[PDB]
């Protein structure tokens, strides 16, 4: 197949307390298969109506495609951005760290600004931190679906998945405390390797 | 600035009786430089917001942001998609022709692909050639304004805007002419570029 | 204020075993809560963009207007169509009966067509079945979020809640459950007296 | 056929010299016409998917009736809402002028809100003076594409069409002039009827 499920970086329950292990369960196993089948499906698709000549799905093929591949991008992304607690630095050094200060003025600015764009998404969503190609910089964008609005050329660097499935078994409504947990596994190694790879254009 | 708007790689009248001279004048000098201006706007709403500590209008320069960058990105590829016809190859060759017959069948199906995305857009949008990282492969997409309906990540690599602006003065309402015309005046050496640079990341 | 969060007509756990009292308490306590303070913000928002003259955040203010607001009217006839096991009839009939026969061949048919529109919606949405004044008939409808997807003047009859919030807790990942066992509970003498109200405009 | 194009009110050319003739006959007979085929056209698609018991396509079939019919609903209002300038009140008297000065202050403030919501859209839209049934109120909201970004049971008042096709061709990328122009044509009896109407819900 083009597209296949990654498999987590570590146990499902190593990111607990603040993510449990259930989530992370039923989130890589269910709902990131369900993309990758998706984005693979939209593919074979697309194929299909090349051969026949046939593009009169194409609006929802497109869709379909976009959707799911987001999908896949945004959550592969995501499950290499966390590490357990412990296992990673708990704040970005180096190139990382100079950047997100010269971007952002400090990491308690741009820790501020990733969260309340996080918090604030009317709909499901994403918080991410991107490198951005044209501007030389590193921005915060918020993500609608996993598809929407976001500039074509977007790295991402640092991802937090916003949608219900994400915290709700363990958090319910209260999103922020989602999130203030999130900082606690966040793998700031993984996002400096992104970074050091990203910014070559 | 963070953001500027380029100048044209040729004259207003340059790709003429394919794109009229008066579409490109209004498009580059009127619609481009707003979404430069909006996209700098937006970056100093952001430095503002985090030097009061108040994100309160966050969801908004979030969509500022990423509306008006996206359009600066779009417009950025979409000028340097095109040359006056006999400025370049009327079909791809090399590296990117094999790849498009490995990805598409053929030239011919790429085109019936990308031209079915093109006219069949509900609202605003772009027609666009994207190299997926993840995928390792080139694929069609379909952005509605400028900035959904896309994975993060996607390398631009051709691009067309269907934007009502893009084609009225001189096409109306029938987009098919306007597609049908654009095609002569691609620029494939630039496609080509983009495509090598990208298959490097 | 202008807008006030509806009493639900029924216990919070009068919906089991179909719907947990623990999402219905969270639901509408917690979630549609949340929409009627924010349709109402929205508001004041706008009369003080008006005495200031000042009407910089218009398209951050609409969009949370029809977001809240949207997400208010949803909930709040989203309570009323549901209703305990055995308060309400299983089946339409008489004249809801007839024109659902009428728009959809069966009530199996506009069954089949609500789920499937329920079950596939890519993101948070609703499915709908509503009046269309313009070709007098009944519509399925797929919402996506809580103001997308839709055309002005449509009159809701039957909603169904295709957020996660609204079934994760009980149903985790499997939608078709959520969906299946939400059909027990509709209250029908709710949508035939929406379906009245709404034939005479 | 369920839905069918309602002719003009008026000649093509009435509106002039605030809206040209060759705008209307192209917006009326062609982008109009369009929403009522391509309604009508997915109206027959879902009967052939609950006849077969195919819904694979529910999504796409979803969007294609609310974009459509949201296309033929705003369009309908759309040219009822004008009138040849000096056939109709400059000014909104009576209840509904009463009305708009109880939820807008004033006339003046309705204008400026309603302008700034029509030259604010990031990508195409409507700006939209509605009836909200469950406030009891009038309301200005921003419709994005023709189906998106507004509350279900929304009754349409006034509507001023902000898609490119809509002024392109006289006022090009100038959208200021041509809502300045617009509202010479504005048919105040009709939203008078409309309101009279709209408010028995
Ligand atoms: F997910
Ligand atoms: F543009
Ligand atoms: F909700
Ligand atoms: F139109
Ligand atoms: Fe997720
Ligand atoms: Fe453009
Ligand atoms: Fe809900
Ligand atoms: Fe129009």
């Known amino acids: 197949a083009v597209y296949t499920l990654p498999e987590l970086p570590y146990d ?20 990131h298969k369900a ?11 697309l194929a299909e109506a090349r051969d026949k000549a046939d593009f ?15 999908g896949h991008v945004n959550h592969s992304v995501f499950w290499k951005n966390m590490a357990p607690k412990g296992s ?22 741009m820790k501020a600004q990733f969260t309340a764009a996080a918090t604030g998404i009317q709909g499901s969503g994403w918080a ?13 964008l918020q993500f609608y679906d996993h598809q929407n609005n976001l ?3 977007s790295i991402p660097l640092l991802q937090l998945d916003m949608w219900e499935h994400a915290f709700y ?16 596994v966040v793998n700031w190694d993984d996002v400096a ?7 070559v254009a």
């Open 35 to 45: 993309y990758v089948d998706g984005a693979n499906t939209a593919l074979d698709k």
């Open 128 to 140: 991410s931190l991107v490198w951005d190609p044209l501007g030389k910089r590193i921005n915060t």
């Open 151 to 153: 500039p074509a050329g």
């Open 12 to 31: 499902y329950s190593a990111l607990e307390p603040y993510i449990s292990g259930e989530i992370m369960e039923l989130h890589h196993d269910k709902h």
């Open 169 to 184: 078994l363990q958090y319910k409504n209260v999103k922020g405390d989602y999130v203030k947990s999130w900082w606690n």
């Open 88 to 109: 990673a630095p708990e704040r970005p050094t180096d190139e990382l760290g100079a950047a997100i200060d010269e971007f952002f003025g400090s990491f308690d600015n």
């Open 193 to 199: 390797l992104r970074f050091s790879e990203a910014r």
């Open 56 to 70: 009169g799905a194409i609006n929802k093929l497109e869709k379909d495609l976009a959707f799911n591949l987001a």
